[PDB]
Ligand binder design. Structure first.
Ligand SMILES: N[C@@H](CCC(=O)O)C(=O)O
Length: 245
């Protein structure tokens, strides 16, 4: 039977991502896709959504990052939350990345907002709560203590739903990864990003005057000699999304 996955693109394609990869559809399919699957994307930020009656044919959903705030009330955000509520009640798998981690927390009664400790734009590390993970489950036989991931956000989950289990934290952000039941799995960082994408964002927000030159240089310094644990993230996220265990 055919495997199908829906990608909710809550961002437009940046110039760099369009030119280098052909857009975020491709970025996500490169990261999370395997040969033979059908991926349909929906530019939810532009108000484009799957039909409600077509949700059953998908084996899983991915919600992308966004430059919008997950606590805002734009009509497409409201419609996204309503559709996520429906998919959630169907017990369909949803992987939420950054904005999508936030949206799922919102749907489940949590609070998202500006992070108490400020924004991040860097490669960083997250600490795994190993007493929340089964050896041989979607985290691997041997769970690492720490995982490197690209961070690019100004908001965080300020109040976590009661139904969520924290799977990872960092010194400055209590909720770096969490799960709800068996079918919701959320990561604050961007496993689909790479150094090129990050460095292009840094350069652009510096040029806009949003950050200082010294902040931009500190941000890039974090990836001068190390990258994220990309292979590890692909394995984790695919294990989750496709029920591979
Ligand atoms: N705008 C949200 C989401 C960021 C993202 O998904 O890249 C934040 O800054 O936290």
């Amino acid at each position: 039977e055919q495997k199908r996955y829906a990608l909710f693109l809550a961002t437009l394609d940046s110039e760099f991502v369009k030119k280098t990869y052909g857009g975020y559809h491709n970025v996500f399919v490169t990261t999370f896709g395997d040969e033979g699957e059908h991926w349909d994307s929906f530019r939810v930020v532009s108000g484009e959504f799957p039909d409600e009656k077509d949700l059953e044919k998908y084996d899983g959903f991915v919600i992308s990052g966004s430059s919008h705030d997950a606590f805002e009330n734009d009509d497409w955000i409201l419609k996204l939350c309503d559709i996520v509520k429906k998919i959630d009640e169907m017990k369909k798998k949803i992987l939420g990345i950054c904005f999508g981690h936030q949206i799922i927390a919102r749907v489940r009664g949590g609070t998202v907002g500006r992070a108490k400790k400020g924004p991040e734009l860097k490669l960083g590390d997250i600490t795994i709560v190993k007493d929340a993970i089964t050896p041989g489950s979607y985290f691997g036989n041997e769970i690492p203590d720490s995982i490197a991931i690209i961070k690019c956000h100004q908001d965080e989950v300020l109040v976590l739903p009661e139904t969520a289990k924290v799977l990872a934290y960092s010194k400055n952000y209590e909720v770096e990864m969490y799960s709800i039941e068996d079918h919701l799995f959320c990561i604050q960082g961007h496993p689909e990003y790479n150094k090129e994408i990050l460095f292009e964002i840094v350069d652009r927000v510096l040029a806009l005057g949003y950050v200082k030159q010294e902040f931009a240089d500190a941000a890039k310094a974090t990836m001068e000699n190390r990258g994220a644990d990309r292979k590890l993230w692909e394995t984790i996220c695919k294990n989750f999304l496709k029920g591979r265990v």
